Amino acid sequence: GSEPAVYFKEQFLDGDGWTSRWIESKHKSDFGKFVLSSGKFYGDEEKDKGLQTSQDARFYALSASFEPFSNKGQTLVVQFTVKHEQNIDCGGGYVKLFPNSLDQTDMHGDSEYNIMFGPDICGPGTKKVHVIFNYKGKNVLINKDIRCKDDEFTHLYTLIVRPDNTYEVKIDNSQVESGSLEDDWDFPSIYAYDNFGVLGLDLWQVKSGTIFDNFLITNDEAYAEEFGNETWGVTKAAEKQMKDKQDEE
Ligand SMILES: [Ca+2]
């Protein structure tokens, strides 16, 4: 009939239903398995179900395709929650947005993506939020140091990329970094990609147990903020109260 474009959304609300929407890469025969779980403590046992890394010291390669789109002349928002319930030592917690040309059964560390975004932890020296744009054959990393969350709780990560070559990074629905694409990377069409068609979780973990949930790819900042409050905002207080109840035990 005669609104925000929701290019991709995943909340894992239909039990085993997610297996049809996500594809495991067969590039290697030893990739780790994601399992559906809400972990040992949660805000809501059912709502907080997400994809959890289940095997230590493994590479992960799982991806979801969606009807392809271009962000040309549009704002692009990529958002998701990451919960390092295990008290992570070293491991990725970022997503990669690929063009539709990706063969999902062959996705691996070298697969050509458009944008990579999210937290990476590797001991005390790396607690950072990556913001990477693939530009003219190179993966260009942000020149700002954005500290990521390293506790056991669910955190919302949001990247906003605007058609005026500006961006914003939010953690828990609050701005943590912003600036211009020309200023914050060493590169007017910089922001735009002809095609996005796959969101991938392509990463390494030593201590596994991270849970990913509430993925959203949209062209509207205000909608991503509302969805953020409907997901992460609903989890927050009750999840903390449950862990506090358990810590005392
Ligand atoms: Ca969920």
Author numbering: 12 to 13, 18 to 202, 303 to 364
Provide text from the study.
shown to play a key role in the MHC class I assembly pathway. cellular processes with broad patho-physiological implications. GSG linker and the C-terminal residues 369–417 were deleted. The long C-terminal α3 helix is kinked at Thr346.
